[PDB]
Design a protein around this ligand. Structure first.
Ligand SMILES: *[C@@H]1O[C@H](CO)[C@@H](O)[C@H](O)[C@H]1NC(C)=O
Lengths: 44, 48
């Protein structure tokens, strides 16, 4: 159980604020991996 | 709209939206899990 997806929008804060949103609003972002899980599964 | 608010002396910068959060009558301004101001109450219209 897991970081970015498309978190640029925080859903309008309709249900509190998750830890990811609180982290994002102060300079802490997560870059997505270069190889998606589909490509990793293709390699496997 | 991204604005430089000043609510009863509390300064900041951000978009203000209507909140589904229901403040209890004694409360004034909310806080996030990481202890940052998340919601405020308008000193004039008593809106959250
Ligand atoms: C402040 O005054 C406005 C009118 O200027 C009024 O609508 C509002 O209810 C007042 N707020 C109070 C009494 O808390």
């Amino acid at each position: 159980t897991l970081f970015i997806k498309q978190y640029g929008d925080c859903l309008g804060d309709i249900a509190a604020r998750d830890l990811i949103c609180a982290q994002k609003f102060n300079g802490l972002t997560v870059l997505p991996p270069l190889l998606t899980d589909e490509m990793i599964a293709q390699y496997t | 709209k991204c604005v430089n608010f000043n609510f009863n002396g509390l300064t900041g910068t951000g978009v203000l939206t209507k909140s589904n959060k229901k403040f209890l009558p004694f409360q004034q301004f909310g806080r996030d899990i990481v202890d940052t101001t998340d919601a405020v109450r308008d000193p004039q219209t008593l809106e959250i």
